[PDB]
Design a protein around this ligand. Structure first.
Ligand SMILES: O=C(O)c1ccccc1Nc1c(Cl)cc(-c2ccncc2)cc1Cl
Ligand SMILES: O=C(O)CCC(=O)C(=O)O
Ligand SMILES: [Mn+2]
Length: 432
């Protein structure tokens, strides 16, 4: 395996022939004014300590990213990757005043990249020919940006690129996941100061394929590249380290149909439709015990707890150093989750009620047991993930908080944190 760079004569015809959906707009093609405002916003957020390495899971392993990151985008939006959900520090679409000015900048950067993306996609459809405009507009409607930083001088040893001799990797071969289908990706690259080892490169290869030589594109200060259409799906990309530190801003159309605050709040209101709601107290009484309704309730119970609450607090309130935006949302989701704990408790009581014909009972058990089985298995993995050896080495203001967590004697919670006792009883009844 080999790789092509601008020094190779075949590079330009390999790009033109087999990467027409990869666009490169060099720093000369965007306003100088913008350059300073964006690069100052990078340095500002870095100086304020807003960028964090993420505690991430790959194939059962807990690892921190080589890159320090922050997610900026629409209020209430989330982006999930490698089992970690990032919550946006929001930008001012229709928080300290300095940090808010950097988010405003990256929304301005977002607006410009959106325009450049629509134009590039309109040109490619023209060459393809030589409605669909609704598709182009939505595949360019970036709703988040994931900022990145890495100082390669701080790493003791970087992985060599394993297939084409591209040298040191900062980020390994991967796809950007959980994007809207065939949506574009726009990256602003900011370097602070065979292929050249000192200059940063983005690498590209065809999925499954290490025989076709891969492209290594140099990225100078303020260069922008665009992955269009299905490029992100059909190709892998990586980041090859240079000598200097580098920032990047990767603008994406996150697929957030189950990943906005509005969505999860409405799911919670849907679960609580089965609850008598005159007054918020400890005696939760349900309106229906139809198995489908209960199943839906316990499934929403698991979604808010694990996809939202435990994801959020696993990051140890790292958003505090940037925004307060999620503090009230997160306290309200926890109060709704608390009511659902009372729902589960209520259901448990009904299964124990003398005078419940066993086949009405067995229909109830068959509808909820998968959810509570999943609830305990995921609680063990989240409790372990919060107390792994790699997680205790973190600072005290980024340490993972395993929340919600209560002790076996806490009288405010109607059910214990560990449900194996409970779980094992219900399947005992279902076969007896
Ligand atoms: O590349 C690495 O060596 C690496 C090691 C540990 C953790 C992460 C690593 N890189 C990496 C990072 Cl930062 C992001 C992603 C990713 C981003 C969006 N959607 C899906 C996956 C993949 C990798 Cl491999
Ligand atoms: O930094 C880049 O240029 C690639 C983007 C990236 O690593 C990511 O957003 O996951
Ligand atoms: Mn990437």
């Amino acid at each position: 395996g080999s790789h092509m760079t601008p020094k190779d004569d075949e590079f330009y015809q390999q790009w033109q022939l087999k990467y027409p959906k990869l666009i490169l707009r060099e720093a000369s093609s965007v306003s100088e004014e913008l350059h300073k405002e964006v690069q100052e916003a990078f340095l500002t957020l870095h100086k304020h300590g807003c960028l964090f390495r993420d505690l991430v899971r790959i194939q059962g392993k807990d690892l921190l990213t080589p890159v320090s990151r922050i997610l900026i985008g629409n209020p209430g939006c989330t982006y999930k990757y490698l089992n970690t959900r990032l919550f946006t520090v929001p930008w001012p679409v229709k928080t300290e005043a300095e940090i808010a000015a950097a988010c405003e900048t990256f929304l301005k950067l977002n607006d410009y990249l959106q325009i450049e993306t629509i134009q590039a996609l309109e040109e490619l459809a023209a060459k393809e020919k030589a409605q669909d405009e609704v598709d182009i507009k939505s595949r360019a409607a970036y709703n988040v940006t994931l900022l990145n930083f890495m100082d390669p001088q701080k790493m003791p040893y970087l992985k060599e690129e394993p297939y084409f001799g591209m040298g040191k990797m900062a980020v390994s071969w991967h796809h950007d996941e959980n994007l809207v289908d065939r949506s574009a990706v726009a990256v602003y690259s900011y370097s602070c100061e065979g292929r050249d080892p000192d200059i940063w490169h983005v690498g590209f290869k065809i999925s499954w394929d290490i025989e076709t030589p891969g492209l290594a594109i140099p990225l100078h200060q303020g260069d922008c590249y665009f992955m269009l259409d299905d490029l992100n799906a059909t190709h892998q990309h990586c980041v090859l380290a240079g000598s200097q530190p580098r920032f990047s801003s990767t603008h994406r159309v996150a697929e957030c149909s189950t990943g906005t605050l509005d969505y999860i709040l409405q799911r919670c209101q849907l679960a609580l439709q089965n609850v008598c709601d005159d007054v918020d107290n400890d005696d939760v009484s349900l309106k229906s015990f139809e198995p489908a309704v209960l199943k839906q309730g316990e499934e929403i119970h698991n979604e808010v707890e694990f996809e939202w609450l435990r994801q959020f607090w696993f990051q140890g309130n790292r958003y505090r150093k940037c925004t307060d935006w999620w503090c009230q949302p997160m306290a309200q989701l926890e109060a709704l989750w608390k009511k659902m704990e009372g729902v589960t408790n209520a259901v448990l009581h009904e299964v124990k009620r003398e005078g419940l014909p066993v086949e009405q009972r067995n229909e109830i058990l068959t509808a909820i047991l998968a959810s509570l089985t999943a609830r305990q298995n995921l609680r063990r993995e989240w409790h372990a993930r919060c107390q792994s050896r790699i997680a205790r080495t973190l600072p005290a203001d980024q340490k993972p908080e395993c929340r919600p967590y209560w002790e076996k004697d806490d009288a405010s919670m109607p059910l214990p944190f560990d449900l194996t006792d409970i779980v094992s009883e219900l399947r005992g009844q279902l076969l007896e």
